[model samples]
Target: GCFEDWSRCSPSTASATGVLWRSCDSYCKVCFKADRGECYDSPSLNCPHRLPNNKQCRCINARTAKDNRNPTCWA
Candidate 1:
């Protein structure tokens, strides 16, 4: 496999899209899903279902499965 947004041995950095909903009014599991690039505005997305209309869910095109990169790409 090849590094998509990062280099293995380079001391450089790039701002890549990462799904993170930890601060939002959502479940931890939901945030985890967001971390893997999975989120939306449907009430079905949340278990208890209580995200205010002012807030919206957003996600990126990231892998939803486990990655061998020790679970993260950012430092």
Candidate 2:
């Protein structure tokens, strides 16, 4: 889940685009993504991969599947 823009959970950083969760007005999930890199004899192109290969903005709390109100990200 994402921290509310008005909640005490301040935005530690900022990003060009942020993920969204629920319909909490302007609420947004933490801005983060996963990727991997490889190397060969010579430099190669960067390879980006979605570790989960799914939506990154998942609801917080262990009960996200059952609860849609808990929209907070883990620290």
Q: Best candidate per lDDT, number? A: 1
Write model 2 residue lDDT over 1-75, tens digit each, in one string.
222221223243221223322122122332122121111111132223211211223223322223234344322
Model 1 steric clash pairs: none
lDDT of each: 0.28, 0.24
Would you list the clashing residue pairs of candidate 2?
1-58, 1-59, 1-60
Please report, as a residue range, the 10-residue window in candidate 1 with the lowest summed lDDT.
1-10
Candidate 1 lDDT over residue span 28-64, tens digit each: 1233343432233344434222223313333443324
Cα RMSD, each candidate = 14.1, 13.1
List TM-scores for all candidates, in order. Answer: 0.18, 0.17
Candidate 1 to truth, TM: 0.18
